[PDB]
Design a binder for this molecule. Sequence first.
Ligand SMILES: *[C@@H](CO)CCCCCC
Ligand SMILES: *[C@@H](CO)CCCCCC
Lengths: 293, 293
Amino acid sequence: AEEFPVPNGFESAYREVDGVKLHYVKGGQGPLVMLVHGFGQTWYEWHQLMPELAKRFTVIAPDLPGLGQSEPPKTGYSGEQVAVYLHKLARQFSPDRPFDLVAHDIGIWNTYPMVVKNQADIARLVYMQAPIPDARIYRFPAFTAQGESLVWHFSFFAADDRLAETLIAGKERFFLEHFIKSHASNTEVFSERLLDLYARSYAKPHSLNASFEYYRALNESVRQNAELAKTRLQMPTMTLAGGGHGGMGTFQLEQMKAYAEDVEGHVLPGCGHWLPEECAAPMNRLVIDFLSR
Amino acid sequence: AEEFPVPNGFESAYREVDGVKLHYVKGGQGPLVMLVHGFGQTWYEWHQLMPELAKRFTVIAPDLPGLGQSEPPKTGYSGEQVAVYLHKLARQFSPDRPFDLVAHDIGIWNTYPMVVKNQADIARLVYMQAPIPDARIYRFPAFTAQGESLVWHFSFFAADDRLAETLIAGKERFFLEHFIKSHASNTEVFSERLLDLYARSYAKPHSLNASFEYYRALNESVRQNAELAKTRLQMPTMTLAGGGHGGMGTFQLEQMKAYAEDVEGHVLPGCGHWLPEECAAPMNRLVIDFLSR
Ligand SMILES: *[C@@H](CO)CCCCCC
Ligand SMILES: *[C@@H](CO)CCCCCC
């Protein structure tokens, strides 16, 4: 079965990687581009970008381990462990050529280690709307003069005794609508129909638990990246961030400059966290232009 | 009936203040000391200190509006609004003499405006384990290298859509036990019987909602206090804080130095947030000595 509608001309398929069955959607022809979603969503967040990219590229959009239709990881949920799965998957389809990478939210966490460790395999890189795990995340405020902060969910999802799963189970549709809309500027794009689709996917018990395990490994990922970041990224990079409610603002580019030699950044006004949905036309344009250079 | 056992020589009673029926427990003879509890708790957190204070003082311990057995406020939940109820309650019993005040956690938020605006009515002040609402609270971290932070609950409780009430309902005992123990050093002082009593009290639907309305009014309290704090406190003040896991550490006294001219502070090693329960005997001694000078 398919949790989300596959775009015309794409195929939904599975690939076993180190004992873990990963789900992905694939289409197009040409050089490979891999698009990696973040928390609360699946490959489907890319569904409007994929048909345009597939006119010039082979496009693959996997579900992160444990999320969507992908099995949970067998090693662990830290960035370095999950990146092995995604690197091996990409290299199944591009064993002889570098590929491009686009990543959003915790897709950044789950790709940065494989990018920095296999720089010859990455031709171009686009990161949007999340910090790379490092000590900077310990400086975000718990509470702001406007109200709730952007990243208090880090502590909620990381808390022990399965606090988040115990409270959210049975209320997944309510919680996801609140979480998505509270991080959005253009809230109107999140129709009840679309919210139903995303909520049914992450309400699967192992997907709800997998969602929070990424955050429970966040401190480990910070410790891993403290070693890995001793080597800067050499390939062309682009960051995107929302400028509106829920957006990372100038932080996205300012952090990336410590990681990358060659980086350009954009802040999209009137857009929050969910750039592919809130600001599809300018985001799609920026990504397609950058990868087509 | 009574939500909590009343100590011998004390009475459980009610007074109407500005149309709001407030519950309190009262005992002893002599000058008045009012004890103001915080989140997750009721007057009962003072039940070990009260019989000792009652040997030299009249002791009153109210339930905050909307919590325990007290009615919700009819004005609002900001500190300046709640402080009116507590000030008028204390003046019913000590109209002709200044009274002492001891407050814990959000009891601080709900008493500081009354103290700074009615300094002649306050003889001595003890504050423990929470910031006065001001801009300093915007510097607390959302997440730490050890896991969840101390005050991410500020954003969780202040979120709209009744987020906290909706996620916690049906799981009130579970959530309160996790909250108490995650801010404690000494968890064994919380028997199943005591947790059951506190969980049953704040699980009342209007008390569960009242608990979080104090946080939804927190930024309004910060703005109110920005004007109030132009007047420094002049009465003898003491701060107490835990030095262990869950404790405020040195922050409590360092903040109070900006508000008060005559302040002494203590940090209790081995103690977390719940000083009257985790560290009853030394906390009791320090309060009694300070008030008895
Ligand atoms: C995905 C990472 O947790 C959600 C990030 C929230 C956006 C904050 C700017
Ligand atoms: C009462 C105020 O929200 C609980 C505060 C605990 C913060 C210090 C650990």
